[PDB]
Design a protein around this ligand. Structure first.
Ligand SMILES: [Mg+2]
Ligand SMILES: [Mg+2]
Lengths: 91, 237, 237
């Protein structure tokens, strides 16, 4: 495998929903065609303070070459820097 | 650049003995992290619940007098509202999945908003969502629209209870607004609540018979008060 | 390394034996897959149509209190709407290819939206599309267009009916909206309908004689209720 980070264009913030999707990264889309697996990230406790998803991030998958797509829930405790499994309800 | 044992001999220039590491392998560490994760996640879920709960309680705009406000801090003095309590208690007990609407009317200083707020507190302890308002605030919301969230909450909420319906004798608009609300609600299989000072007859030319048709569902709960005041006695602890 | 006999001799050891390949050649395989595919496509198409039908149910604005709703759960007490149901059944029957629009009227608590929702469900089962609205929703939509699927739909559905046409006394807007709508509908040889609580003369000054003239085509269907309320019975089943 390979793991290659990237970045996103700020034409998403004005959407007022702020979940990422495939057509949001604008680097020619040259990697959207080359890849096999993608995992965007969203985390509500940045863009809001009072939003009731504190200590949670989520893994928006947007492309799967050999499988389907989905969405996953994980936590974040940024002072010792490790996501953990979310043993709880569904999304 | 340095040996293992000697790296550790560099390490022991920091703390004493009696600090043994206890790991002894890797997969045991993964088990340990999994333990801590399953712990901290559930504790976090608890805290998230308490947050969401408070986000409700600060949103049900109730003014602080009627907050430390329950069935119990209600000094009974005659039967006239002993019946009111016997009805309001069972109203709460019957609220679970019912078209159960109530109205209050009578004289001020008789415990209208007190019982209303007690009800709302108990229903929020059950884990519901409610709201009360002043009719002028609805006016103000419809004006802010002409400068949606609060507008549509008045039909996305389970229960509403309404306050100060008689005043604003600049009428003919109040009626159409309240009609709009209550039709959207009662057609949607949900309750509401009113508060006033007048008899139903006086009330009915303000509020055409259709609205009270939308009120008189199920075992619709009419109540009317006649007590004298209480305000000279109250302190505000 | 390995080859065919060794490969398959590796293969059988994974499983229980007597598992013969059952094909033995190519054209049999292709025929078999064509057969499975033509079997699969049919049930697929069926499911897709069922989806479409659900999307048509959930689009109409029928509220839950008129959802579990039809002709048969409507209780007779006199001739006064025995006539009405003998009209409603035949109306649903005479609807296909027909400029047959209608109005209801009279007292609240009398089964207007009930019959309307019954009609709407029966025409969904006929395979035709419907919609019922509060007029204030059209108001809000015309205001929200500053933010077209809805206004497009309102001039292309087969049927349409309306609710809360009396109130909103701040007129000089309601009349023109509904006139535009009904012109675009009647022009395309399509019906519509209305619901109200007022008299035709009490209606006509709100709604100029032209609009009611556009309602007066085919064998029209006027109704005027006299029945009393129903609310005391209902409990929200
Ligand atoms: Mg009060
Ligand atoms: Mg109606």
């Amino acid at each position: 495998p390979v793991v290659a980070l990237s970045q996103l264009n700020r034409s998403l913030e004005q959407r007022a929903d702020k979940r990422p999707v495939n057509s949001d990264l604008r680097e020619s889309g040259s990697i959207e065609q080359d890849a096999d697996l993608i995992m965007f990230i969203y985390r509500d406790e940045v863009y809001h303070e009072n939003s009731d998803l504190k200590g949670i991030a989520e893994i928006i998958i947007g492309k799967q070459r050999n499988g389907p797509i989905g969405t996953v829930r994980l936590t974040f405790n940024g002072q010792w820097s490790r996501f953990d499994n979310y043993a709880g309800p569904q999304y | 650049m340095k040996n293992v044992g000697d790296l550790m001999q560099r390490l022991q220039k920091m703390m004493p003995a009696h600090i043994k590491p206890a790991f002894k392998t890797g997969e045991e560490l993964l088990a340990w992290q999994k333990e801590q994760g399953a712990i901290r996640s559930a504790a976090l879920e608890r805290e998230n619940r308490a947050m969401k709960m408070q986000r409700t309680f600060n949103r049900s705009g109730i003014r602080p007098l009627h907050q430390n406000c329950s069935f119990e801090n209600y000094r009974v003095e005659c039967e006239g509202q002993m019946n009111a309590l016997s009805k309001a208690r069972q109203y709460v007990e019957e609220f679970d999945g019912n078209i159960a609407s109530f109205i209050f009317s009578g004289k001020p200083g008789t415990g209208k908003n007190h019982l209303a707020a007690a009800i709302c507190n108990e229903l929020l302890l059950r884990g519901k969502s409610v709201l009360i308002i002043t009719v002028a605030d609805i006016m103000s919301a419809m004006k802010d629209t002409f400068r949606e969230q609060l507008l549509n909450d008045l039909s996305n909420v389970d229960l509403l209870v309404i306050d100060e319906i008689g005043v604003q004798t600049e009428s003919k608009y109040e009626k159409v607004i309240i009609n709009q609300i209550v039709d959207r609600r009662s057609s949607s299989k949900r309750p509401t609540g009113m508060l006033t000072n007048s008899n139903m007859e006086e009330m009915t030319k303000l509020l055409g018979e259709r609205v009270m048709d939308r009120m008189r569902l199920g075992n619709s709960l009419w109540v009317i008060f006649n007590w004298d005041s209480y305000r000279s006695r109250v302190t505000g602890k």
